[PDB]
Each structure stands twice: as structure tokens, then as C-alpha cells.
Amino acid sequence: RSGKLPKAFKIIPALSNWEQILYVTEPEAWTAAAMYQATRIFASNLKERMAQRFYNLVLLPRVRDDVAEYKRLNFHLYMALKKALFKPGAWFKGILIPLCESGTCTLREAIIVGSIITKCSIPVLHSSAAMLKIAEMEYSGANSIFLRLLLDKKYALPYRVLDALVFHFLGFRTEKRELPVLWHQCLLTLVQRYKADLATDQKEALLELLRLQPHPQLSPEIRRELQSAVPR
């Protein structure tokens, strides 16, 4: 509950057969403070591979379990995820991308992970890599929240990454399914933050999207921001 753990638990990254020791320590029966300390020690001793494997095997299933059970993330587990983001390579490749690729991401975890991302400063290279990873996978409902919050992180956006995002938006013309306006909010954020990085054919593509997929309220605002956008 409180105090310090025995220091032999902190020599686990210094070991060679750390997986057997981890299975002995039974991470499924750990408490939130113990997992927070474990993530802190794992992020304080380099070795992005073992941290990524720990997040894939331990932290993400426990987050899924207590979000599905208690309908809210734990306080110490929120700190554990914040500590895990201090090594952003392990956090993106170990928690965010596998949960996005799972296809069963809940909205609560989507909002929690997005708030964690907007709490923190993301590197421009890492943010662009995250953009390219989101834009290349299949469409899901919760992924638009991730893309919108990464977009209103408001970082510099390269050529191929922005074009991949644009063609991800262009991949929706033949879809007759009802679309959320949250996707339109991600689109509006992209237009509002990157109107100077929008070329011509992209702009008429978005106008014909708004003609094909209209919205009573936010689509006029998207039309205004496209029509009053200066290039270059």
C-alpha cells in the first residue's frame, strides 16, 4: 500500500532471465501502486524492448480489465501510464498502437489516452510516426478521438504524413454508413490547424466530401474554413 518495495524487485532489469522472474512475481495479482513502481523502474533503466513487452503483456491487459470493471482508470495506474510515456517509444509501440489495432478499444480508454497525450509533450518525429500509424490502419470509432487529440497537439506536419492523413479522409467516399461528427471534428481540427498546408485538389476533395456527406451544423464551419484558407 505505501512505503518502499524490497530492492530485489528493482534489480529485475539488471537480470538476464527477467521473464521468468516476472512470471514468478505474478503481475496479474499486483496492486496499482506496485505496478506504478514497476513501470517507473522499467522506464528508469533504458531497454525499450522489455518495457514495450511489459506494457503489451501486463499494463495493457490490466488497464483493459479495470476499465471494463470499475468504468474508470485507477489513480496510481494513471500515474503509471504517465511514467510510461516518459519513454515515448515504448508507450506508443506497447500500448497505443496495439490497442488501436485490437479493434475493441473503448471510448473511455480513448479519452483517457488522449488526455494523457495532451497532458504531455510529444516529439515531432514521434508525433508524425503516430500520425502515419493511425492513418495506415483500418477505421474504428475510437481512433478518430486519438487522431483529433494528436492533431490539436499542434505540431509541425511533414509531407507524406499529411498526405497519408488526407487519403485516410479520402478513403470514405463509397461508405454509406452513418458517420459520427467526431470524425468531422478531427477533420475541422486538421483544417483549422493546417489550412496553410492544404493544396488545391485536397480542398476540392474536402468540398465534394462535404457535398456528399453533409452535416447541419459543423459542415458550414468546415466550408467557411476551407473557403477562407490561404495556401503556402
Binding site: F92, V124, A129, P158, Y159, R160, V161, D163, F167
Partner: peptide, 24 residues
Amino acid sequence: SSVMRRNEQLTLHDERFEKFYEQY
């Protein structure tokens, strides 16, 4: 990969995107 770009007005960093998905 896309077909169009931002075309002109220079580049700053090409960005290293192959260090994330290539791990797993």
C-alpha cells in the same frame, strides 16, 4: 504512399517513421 505533396517552399526534416512499426 501518396501521389501529391506540398510541392514547394523547402523541407526541414524528412522524419524517421520506420523505427516504430518495424519493431513488431
